[PDB]
Write a protein that binds this ligand. Structure first.
Ligand SMILES: [Zn+2]
Length: 46
């Protein structure tokens, strides 16, 4: 009941920031780039 952690189908690689599954570990790491490279109004730090 509510166990999850089951890769019945979806790839074991999914972005935990937006929600995107990729069929390549390298793809997931690359996508993150979009998350770590934006101009957030009022850039204080980061
Ligand atoms: Zn993402």
């Amino acid at each position: 009941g509510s166990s999850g952690s089951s890769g019945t189908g979806e790839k074991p690689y999914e972005c935990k920031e937006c929600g995107k599954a990729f069929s390549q570990t390298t793809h997931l790491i690359q996508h993150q780039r979009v998350h770590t490279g934006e101009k957030p109004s009022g850039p204080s730090s980061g």
